[PDB]
Amino acid sequence: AMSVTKQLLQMQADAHHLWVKFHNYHWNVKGLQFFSIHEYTEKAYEEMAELFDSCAERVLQLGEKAITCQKVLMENAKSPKVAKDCFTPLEVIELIKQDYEYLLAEFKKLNEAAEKESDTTTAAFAQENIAKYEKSLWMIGATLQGAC
Amino acid sequence: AMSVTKQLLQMQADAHHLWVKFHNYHWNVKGLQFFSIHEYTEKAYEEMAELFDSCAERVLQLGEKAITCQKVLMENAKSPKVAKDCFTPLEVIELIKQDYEYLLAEFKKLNEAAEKESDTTTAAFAQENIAKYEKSLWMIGATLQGAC
Amino acid sequence: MSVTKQLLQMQADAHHLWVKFHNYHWNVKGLQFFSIHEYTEKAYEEMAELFDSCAERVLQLGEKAITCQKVLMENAKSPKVAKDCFTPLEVIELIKQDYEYLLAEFKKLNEAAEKESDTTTAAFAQENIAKYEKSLWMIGATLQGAC
Amino acid sequence: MSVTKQLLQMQADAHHLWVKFHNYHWNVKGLQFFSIHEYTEKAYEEMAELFDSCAERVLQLGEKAITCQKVLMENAKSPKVAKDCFTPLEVIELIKQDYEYLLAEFKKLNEAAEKESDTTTAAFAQENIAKYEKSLWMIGATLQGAC
Amino acid sequence: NAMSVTKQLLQMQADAHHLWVKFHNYHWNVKGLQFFSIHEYTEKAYEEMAELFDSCAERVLQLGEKAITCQKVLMENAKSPKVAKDCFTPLEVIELIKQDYEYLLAEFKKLNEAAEKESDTTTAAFAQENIAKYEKSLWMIGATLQGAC
Amino acid sequence: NAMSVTKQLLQMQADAHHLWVKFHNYHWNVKGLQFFSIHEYTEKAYEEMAELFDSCAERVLQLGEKAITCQKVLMENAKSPKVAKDCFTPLEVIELIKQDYEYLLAEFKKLNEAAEKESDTTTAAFAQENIAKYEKSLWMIGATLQGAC
Amino acid sequence: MSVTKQLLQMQADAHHLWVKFHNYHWNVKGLQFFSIHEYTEKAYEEMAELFDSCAERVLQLGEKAITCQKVLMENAKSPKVAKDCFTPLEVIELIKQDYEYLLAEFKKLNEAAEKESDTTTAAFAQENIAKYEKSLWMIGATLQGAC
Amino acid sequence: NAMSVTKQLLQMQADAHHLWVKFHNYHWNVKGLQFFSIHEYTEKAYEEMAELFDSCAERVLQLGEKAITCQKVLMENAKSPKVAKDCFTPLEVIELIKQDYEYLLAEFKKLNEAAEKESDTTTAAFAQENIAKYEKSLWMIGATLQGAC
């Protein structure tokens, strides 16, 4: 049963990490599409705050402790690190693709762990997010591609 | 009197055709402006569904039969054919310009036929659409142009 | 068969029902004309949405949606109707058969999705199974006479 | 008649139909009572708007609207109804005849307006011509049996 | 000896119709600086008369008698004040509406007394709701017409 | 000699519960072309019964007696018409609802008379509001069932 | 029990909780009266929705819902409450026990649904399992003392 | 021999003003864990008192007497309970508001009796609407103060 709460706790830390990272994209993008990227990443960091809270509260429902220490959040984060603080629009979209691919893989890991424990609530939460990101990733991939 | 219902029936088939075609643009556009083109063509195919229904129902009001067979719709369609299934944003906008120019010419044909029959209801329907497309085509032309 | 093959079948069927549901909408006759006209309007709107959802899922899955109307026509397998004038009870009976067809296809889609471990497509199929099971209950009752 | 004479005729008729549509609204009996009650309520509200619009167009054109109910009574020419009890089908048949009358009167108004180059009245006539042609289609389909 | 609830409602039906027509006269034909506010006020007023007409008719039908369906009968039965004018200043309209509302109020009081003698709680509540409405409106209209000390 | 307001409200509580259950039977089990409109009408109806149940209970509590909290007592005390059917045509449902509403109306009139003898203005207003509601509804239901001349 | 037997059990129980939650709603006393009154009102509205949903799922599955209140009374198995007066804490403790009962019953419904490959009922069970697991967490925290 | 409707309304005007001021005292000066919910409840309450003040004044004016316009007269005429406190626990506020509402309720009952003797349906309806409001509120406030069996 610890594997479900272990994976929720991993996601809590990654959600925090992406919330910080998505602010970086939001502030520091430059170029003609500044405003739409700014608005896009604003919605995205809001989703990461919500995801942060949901993972924590699911852990609590499952009888464990959520992470409450900045230091632990920082140490446990495993989503892609970025060294930049200035971006083109296409660079942000490419970075987000990578961040969403990481989230997608981690949600499928959560689903499996939920499956082994017969945890339908956590499985439903995982799968709603899998659907959300497979849809976004299709759109992001099309945004990065050139036409034949 | 058959010329008004003949032209409404032509438009019914073209509206169906453009509804299918506009999905093609909606799905298969690639590049940075993916999302706005996707949203734009979504509104456009909704207008073509509405146009499909309006033409059919006007024919019925005029005492004739709307087309109800896929095969007849396909055979009767005369709006521009496209062979592609992958597009740049500028390519979609250029294709839509051509589709809207075709609609505009066909609505003016409908207006004339309505005029000869003193059909004020069909004439009003034609003219509301002429105004709509002359306005859109101005915007689309500006979108495709370079500045002096 | 496969998730993408089944999605493409449903895309073609959604287009066919979108067209047929307009025939019911336009051509029903009788005292319940307006309620039937309104009902079929909402139904065709759902068929348009289904058409789009099926295509986009195929695209998300790395395959091409159908974009040619001739292919849509050739591939559709939902019930054919060679009438263009209906009573309200005839429309309801036809919609029942159309919804029985969709429900069976959604169940095939779910099976295919569970085999492929595709939770997203499975969730899509299951939401539709629930929608049609409920709607078919009400349609059945509409067509019955009491005990 | 000239545009104003025709507007004044339509003012009288809108008043007459407003009264009559209340008769349908109150006095229909049978399973579809509530839908007819609701439809006829919308219809009389439309007749009240029509009455005001005709009158105010007359005032815009420099003439006096009808203000005496006795004149309104004497000038009305829309179909007379003797009954005070109806089936839903009878009401729909009577509304069709009322709407046919209005539609023909709006066409007379339009011709009159066109001759006087009165674009405002013409646009008002044509907007209503469109409204009644659409309704009359639906009403016709409602009274039909399927073939 | 006064007429029953149903005959009072029938009278009220005929008057509401008459006032609906009459209020259009004020709506169309007022002249002067306050044209628009009088036009809007009288539009709300005729809409209330249309509603009253339908309410009285439907209450008569609920009580088992038939509503009036003929415009000749509506015209002959109306007893609300007539006006032989088709042009008005704003003060004239306000004065005339005061007379119309005083008339309505008096008739709603008769309606209430009839409803009470018949133990008709539904019609009594209907009458009293309206009595409250015109007592308030008449206070405001009276203040609009008065001169300050 | 008739029972007090509080005992009448307690009866009304039990009936509202019974009709809430019964209206679900009509909601679920009507069959025929008008299935959906009957399904929706009866859904609005049971929601009104749920509200009535809570209102009567809370008024009894305001008057210092205790509401019924046991389903066995609710079942034993209900006096509204029973139906031994679980399948209905649309006309059957309309006919049966007419009988249920005529029952309610008669009980709300008793409630009003009891409230008046007790000078209970709150309960009287509550009863009369409901009397007005069912008199209107019963007029429409009766018209729905009649045949035109 | 099979899916329908289990749905019918939950129909009876939803009815029972609807009644009981009114008892909490009316009869709580103490400083938090109004918030408990409001919370329990939302809770009984949820029980009324649950009652209708179970019944209609049964009808969809081809069986008859419970229509006799005597059957509803006899089949209910959720916790019995003898009292008719409560403190806010007592109400919260009693609701926790009611919600634990429901949560266990929804899990039985889900297992039953999964065995019958009934995705619609399964989704309905799991949606409620999620709802009660979340509520029960909050309720538990509400009854606790801090460490 | 009891005072007329108009003098009762004038009393009610003065009290509503007093309670409007007093309810601010509870609003500002409550202390303790339930500070915010008491602050909000008493804000809704003073807003109701402001409305009552205006309603009573306007009804007096409709009845042809003049409303009170001087704050010295408002202060001298108020008879609702005074409180010589400017700090409160939540339970104290609830207890004090119970006393204020019991006072209002008793005065609205006198208002109703006066309105009935005068056949003043408008004021009677106004009084009874308010009687219904405080009977419900007082039930809830009483439950908030009680201890469970």
Added chain:
Amino acid sequence: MSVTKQLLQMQADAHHLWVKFHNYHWNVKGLQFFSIHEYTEKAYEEMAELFDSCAERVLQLGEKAITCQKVLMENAKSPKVAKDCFTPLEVIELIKQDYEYLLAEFKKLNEAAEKESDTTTAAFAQENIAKYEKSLWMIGATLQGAC
């Protein structure tokens, strides 16, 4: 003259009235200050919209809109006012003359549009003709004294 020439004239006039209508809005004095201030606010907002619509129609028609304020000033031909303090009745009388001017220009635009078979510009002119005919009726009545 031509549709585009007439549109450009109206563009210049819309700008002029937009400015003048602010003068009425700011500088009216007297008891009806606020209603006049609100009325003229809505009116200048319509002038801004008219300015934009006229320019964009010229652009749709392949010609250049006016973009220089000196050209706008030189070309405006609506009534000049050399006052900056007004009574409410003076504002209404001036607005009447401004609206009579606009109505005549809209009629010229319609004629030009019908000659050019330009249904879009004609519809634009006719919607405005109807708006101003109605508004001038009400303004006239505002300025009259009763019989």
Added chain:
Amino acid sequence: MSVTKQLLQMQADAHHLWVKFHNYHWNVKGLQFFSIHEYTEKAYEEMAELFDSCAERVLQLGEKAITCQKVLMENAKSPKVAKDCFTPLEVIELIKQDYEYLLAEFKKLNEAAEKESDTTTAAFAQENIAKYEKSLWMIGATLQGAC
């Protein structure tokens, strides 16, 4: 006065104006009755908000608000009104004098706040200074005759 002494003065005055504005609201007579009735209603609602805001700012600053109506009566210094019947123009003239009084008191509050480096009270003063300067302009224009 210090900031709190000045806030307490404004608390008393807001109470006084709340009462007075009801007098204007009830007792105005003449053609503009309804607009004055509506304007003064908004005005007293503003005075009630002002009364609460001053009191709560005092509480924030560590002092006690006024709770006794006798103190409120004795401390009020806004213009005394003896009348209980008014023309619309008289009401507007009296409101101008009330608003001038408030505006001067808000300026005193601002100076006091600035001296104490109290940004919160200062911002509150200045927001109201802006409000009354704008209103007083409109009120002035309303009382004027045009030149």
Added chain:
Amino acid sequence: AMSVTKQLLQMQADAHHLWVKFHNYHWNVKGLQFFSIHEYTEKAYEEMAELFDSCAERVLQLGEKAITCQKVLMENAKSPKVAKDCFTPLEVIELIKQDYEYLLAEFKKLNEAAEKESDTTTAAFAQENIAKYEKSLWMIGATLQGAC
């Protein structure tokens, strides 16, 4: 005291000027971002109409006369003049940057004049606008920049 009303009157004339100029951008931009620039400049000219009215009405509150003559508005305008009537999207954004920089400098001039007169109402109006334009100018500058 004349320096506050002098500066409000300068701003009234510039607001009028920018309202005309912003229509020029709105109509005459060409290129892929036509529609968003069109929408952006539409909001901007609405703000300039509002600014025009606010400056005028503040002058009137201060006991002076607003400008009511087109000719005076034209003569007094000092915001940047543009000679073009056709623009790329980036050209419009660059021109707006310059127009907003001018507004920002003029609002700070207004604030100072308000300060010297203790005019808190005009100072508040100035400062609300300073905040608005410093925020917009940050966004506009990022839109024009390239990433490091």
Added chain:
Amino acid sequence: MSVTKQLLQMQADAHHLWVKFHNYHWNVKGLQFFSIHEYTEKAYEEMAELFDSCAERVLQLGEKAITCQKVLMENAKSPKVAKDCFTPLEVIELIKQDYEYLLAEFKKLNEAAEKESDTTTAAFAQENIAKYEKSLWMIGATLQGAC
């Protein structure tokens, strides 16, 4: 110190409080669990907004916002809490200390802003000073016992 240095300090503090306010939100125990949970949700949402506003002001001022969580952690100076279980009164007492800290920092920001003649940052600081002065009043009263 400087405006940008103070803004960066507050950015780090906003992040720290955002995290801590979630601890209160999750881990409070007792009868007021839900109101405290809702209160702290709104509070953390304000901390997220504050984080963003502080960063964007620094960027507007030509400097870089903090984008590394290690820097955020190192720089935060708001009160540390080494508990993860709370009563409702403990949460309120901690929030009081957190809000006292923010208020003092906002006052330093205002001073720095006025020195730099930065009206925009000063307005930001002052709106927050007013918000926290009011909220601390209410929190204080929540923690008191009456006289």
